[PDB]
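Ubiquitin-fold modifier 1
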Amino acid sequence: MSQNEEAPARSGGKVTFRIILTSERSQPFRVISIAEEAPLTAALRFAAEEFGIASVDSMAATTKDGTGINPAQTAGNVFMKYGQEIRLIPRDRVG
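Tokens:
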């Protein structure tokens, strides 16, 4: 029981995030576009491609300041805490 719905980016604020992937040497940069008032699920749809797997184990992101693991993955929380230029590192996948 699931229904796909479009994100409400038509009405609201739009925020873009750039994540550097270390798991994708060919393209270490995926951009997700979600509304500020949009749910973390919109990011998750593209995040799945970024993690390359549907597992929280690949949620070992680091921010420029240091630890920057994405928790709620909400647009507002990520924007204020890491914004763009966040690095994503997988855990238990590197080796």
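The chain has one domain: 1-95.
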